[PDB]
């Protein structure tokens, strides 16, 4: 087949390669059971303005994102740095939660590297943002027949805003050289402005509820991820392994190298993962590539 002939002369020829196949699959996760509170992140009622955006740091739990997949109440659901269906088994160090209220038409400028008034002036999303954003209509609650004016945003300021900032000061804007000093003259303007939400307003003018979730993957040990079940370990054979999202194929073996208590895994040569600390027994396991080689056939 390789030499494209029905007759072959005497000699030695290289045909193909082989690899030892894994026999089992093992998954390891830390034994943690408490559910961390997504309840008062989406079902909560007390939320803040555009420039007063709420900050919640959530950790030390396990999470099930299946509520996010199947809840039809969520109007738009667009993830970027990861595929939405894959969050069920990836494992993350920490999760950042932001909540704030935006008029419906300004949803498109809440995007990685997007330009706009809210983007450049209130809340800008970084270019390499590896998280996801959710939003849904809320005209039924955040609107009154007489008009609700409690929500404000800032739109006059000199320079662009860095990705993770918050400002609440409302100093008078010096649009001109006149030092009006707290009085809104013709050359000055008050930095804030309020959205006039009424139920008679158009759908684009209707208020919307937006929550932003961001993830980061560092070398630090992970703390929050899905309910994927763990299993017993197998040693001295070719086997597929999963360690807090780190996946591959190899042979697990005891190690004599000593890890520092703050270290987790090794990259000794050419950034290759050779050792992984066991989350349960704290013992360091060596990774060895599964056996492989070429095939040569000798014929007369």
């Amino acid at each position: 087949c390789t030499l494209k002939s029905f007759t072959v002369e005497k000699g030695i020829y290289q045909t193909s390669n082989f690899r030892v196949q894994p026999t089992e699959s093992i998954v390891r996760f830390p034994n943690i059971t408490n559910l961390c509170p997504f309840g008062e992140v989406f079902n909560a009622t007390r939320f803040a303005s555009v420039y007063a955006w709420n900050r919640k740091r959530i950790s030390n739990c396990v999470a099930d994102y299946s509520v996010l997949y199947n809840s039809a109440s969520f109007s738009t659901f667009k993830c970027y740095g990861v595929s939405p269906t894959k969050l069920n088994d990836l494992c993350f160090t920490n999760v950042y939660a932001d909540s704030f209220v935006i008029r419906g038409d300004e949803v498109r400028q809440i995007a990685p590297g997007q330009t706009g008034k809210i983007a450049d002036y209130n809340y800008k999303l970084p270019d390499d943002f590896t998280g996801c954003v959710i939003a849904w209509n809320s005209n039924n609650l955040d609107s009154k027949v007489g008009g609700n004016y409690n929500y404000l945003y800032r739109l006059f300021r000199k320079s662009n805003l860095k990705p993770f900032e918050r400002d609440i000061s409302t100093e008078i804007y010096q649009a001109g050289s006149t030092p009006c000093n707290g009085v809104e003259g013709f050359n000055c303007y008050f930095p804030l402005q309020s959205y006039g939400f009424q139920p008679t307003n158009g759908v684009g003018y209707q208020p919307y509820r937006v929550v932003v979730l961001s993830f980061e993957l560092l070398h630090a040990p992970a703390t929050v991820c899905g309910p994927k079940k763990s299993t017993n370990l197998v040693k001295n054979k070719c086997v597929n392994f999963n360690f807090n999202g780190l996946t591959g194929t190899g042979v697990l073996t005891e190690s004599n190298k000593k890890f520092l208590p703050f270290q987790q895994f090794g990259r000794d040569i050419a950034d290759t993962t050779d050792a992984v600390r066991d989350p349960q027994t704290l013992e360091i396991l060596d990774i060895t590539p599964c056996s492989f080689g070429g095939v040569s056939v000798i014929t007369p």
Binding site: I269, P289, G294
Partner: protein
Amino acid sequence: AQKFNGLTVLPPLLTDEMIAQYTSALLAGTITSGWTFGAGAALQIPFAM
């Protein structure tokens, strides 16, 4: 180099033992027969002449 993924090395066909044997045979021939063994059958002759 050391063991890692992707690539392998192949041993040479002739070992060091065989190369050393070849050199020893060449040295013995050139000290016991001069240039005669290169052209054909070796002819014994003392080193002085």
